[PDB]
A paper describes a structure:
The 1-deoxy-D-xylulose 5-phosphate pathway of isoprenoid precursor biosynthesis is an attractive chemotherapeutic target because it occurs in many pathogens, including Mycobacterium tuberculosis, and is absent from humans. The protein is a homotrimer with three equivalent active sites formed at the subunit interfaces.
The structure of MsIspF bound to CDP was determined to a resolution of 2.2 Å. Each subunit displays an α/β fold which contains six β-strands, five α-helices, and two 310 helices. The active site comprises a rigid nucleotide and cation (Zn2+ and Mg2+) binding pocket and a flexible loop for binding the ME2P moiety of substrate. Only one of the two cation-binding sites, the Zn2+ site, is occupied here. In MsIspF the density observed in the cavity is diffuse and we presume that a similar mixture of ligands may be present.
Residue numbers in the entry:
A (entry chain B), C (entry chain A): 3 to 35, 38 to 157
B (entry chain C): 3 to 157
The structure:
Amino acid sequence: LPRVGLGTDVHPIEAGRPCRLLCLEFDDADGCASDGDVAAHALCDALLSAAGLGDLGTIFGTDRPQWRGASGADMIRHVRGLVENAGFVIGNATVQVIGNRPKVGPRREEAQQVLSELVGAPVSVSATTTDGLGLTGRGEGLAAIATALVAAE
Amino acid sequence: LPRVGLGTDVHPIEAGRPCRLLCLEFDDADGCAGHSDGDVAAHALCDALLSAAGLGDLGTIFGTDRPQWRGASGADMIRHVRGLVENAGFVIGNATVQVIGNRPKVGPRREEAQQVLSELVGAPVSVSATTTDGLGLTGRGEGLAAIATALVAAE
Amino acid sequence: LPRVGLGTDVHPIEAGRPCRLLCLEFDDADGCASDGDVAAHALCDALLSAAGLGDLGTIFGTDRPQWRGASGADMIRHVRGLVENAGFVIGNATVQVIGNRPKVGPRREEAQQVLSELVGAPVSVSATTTDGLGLTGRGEGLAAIATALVAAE
Ligand SMILES: Nc1ccn([C@@H]2O[C@H](COP(=O)(O)OP(=O)(O)O)[C@@H](O)[C@H]2O)c(=O)n1
Ligand SMILES: Nc1ccn([C@@H]2O[C@H](COP(=O)(O)OP(=O)(O)O)[C@@H](O)[C@H]2O)c(=O)n1
Ligand SMILES: Nc1ccn([C@@H]2O[C@H](COP(=O)(O)OP(=O)(O)O)[C@@H](O)[C@H]2O)c(=O)n1
Ligand SMILES: C=C(C)CCOP(=O)(O)OP(=O)(O)O
Ligand SMILES: [Zn+2]
Ligand SMILES: [Zn+2]
Ligand SMILES: [Zn+2]
């Protein structure tokens, strides 16, 4: 049987930080307190759970010198290698961004292309607001939830 | 290899609005805000199917406040998304949705909800519900949330 | 085709209450207000939804005498049985804990062992914080979210 995984991530928006999201950089928005890319983090966690390999802390720890400066793209590439070396093929992954700004839509196809090449399987990208409700609706943070489907050789 | 997708949606409760939820009409309840009928479970399901199939999200398909989709039922939206999914070459295997909120109570109409949604999706749809125990974005009867998954396969 | 399901759950944290989480005891932190095992509940809901069998309310009712005070392990044991009886084989399941305390990392592999034995299939365990934001970030509550994959026969 194929195996399913899921990951979520939430970070505060940091005013004046460059907006790194979905392995893109967005003009006219602020990023999150790596580069704070909530979508990349959720995707790593979905892939790692699908394959039984733990989560971000398990594999990256905190302030390890070998991960200094590394982006969401660097993390995804590394997670992809771990999943493949554990004997899995990646079927697909999806990620939904939850928050107000930036608007993901105008660059949604570009994100899908960037992320599908990082993962080596089709990655679906979507977005929603919460219509003013909760930490995301208040513009306090950005959230993402991701799924992945892998299968053992 | 089959493909999995996920969708979530959140709306505030709007006083006096008819409660359209899970493609059912719940009397004795409001009533989510939106350009649509505010069916949070239908929107989440549409998102889950569109994402499993790599076809975008609601904004991709229905746009913003388009005259053609005003007051559009969740049923309209699901039937439209089912056709897009099948035209793109996929068979829908199953889908699931969990409603997160205090009112209405889904339990009494859960089996009916699954019946309606399975007909519209063309595959078995699981329905569940949870409250928040008085906590968070929807812990007050402030709003309703839904989270949905879907599984599709070529060809 | 195999079938996917998802489950979420949120409980308030209560001072003094024993922390039963992921079918372990963290004799350590608070402490949710059955035994408040948010992760066991989410997992049950994911399995039931994949199999098309309802949710916790469907199956344990409300204040049913025979399930009054059923632990998380009791619940998953029964859910596993319902799923197999409906003619399904469980492929895998995953659960992410969302909250500040306890720290799941040091006992993550133990939780995976315990839960995999109870489900009869590989259970992935992970954890995240919300970096100070929302009900879990303020320490008012603990949440979990879980997926499951099952197949007929
Ligand atoms: N950060 C965001 C939020 C929404 N959107 C888009 O805007 C449309 C409307 O979003 P919404 O705020 O109604 O989200 P929901 O609460 O209806 O699910 C979505 O379907 C997406 O296409 C986006 O591109 N980026
Ligand atoms: N809007 C809602 C919310 C919950 N429920 C029911 O409440 C049951 C348990 O959710 P809850 O939050 O009320 O109770 P626990 O999650 O604390 O066990 C669910 O399995 C549903 O059967 C419902 O029917 N309609
Ligand atoms: N209650 C918790 C929360 C997080 N953790 C661990 O803390 C690490 C850091 O989580 P985080 O605060 O960066 O959460 P994210 O929003 O980045 O996903 C996680 O990868 C887990 O290994 C834990 O062990 N127990
Ligand atoms: C959509 C997500 C990620 C949850 C936000 O809700 P909150 O947990 O912030 O709810 P509040 O108590 O802050 O209103
Ligand atoms: Zn993160
Ligand atoms: Zn909506
Ligand atoms: Zn519970």
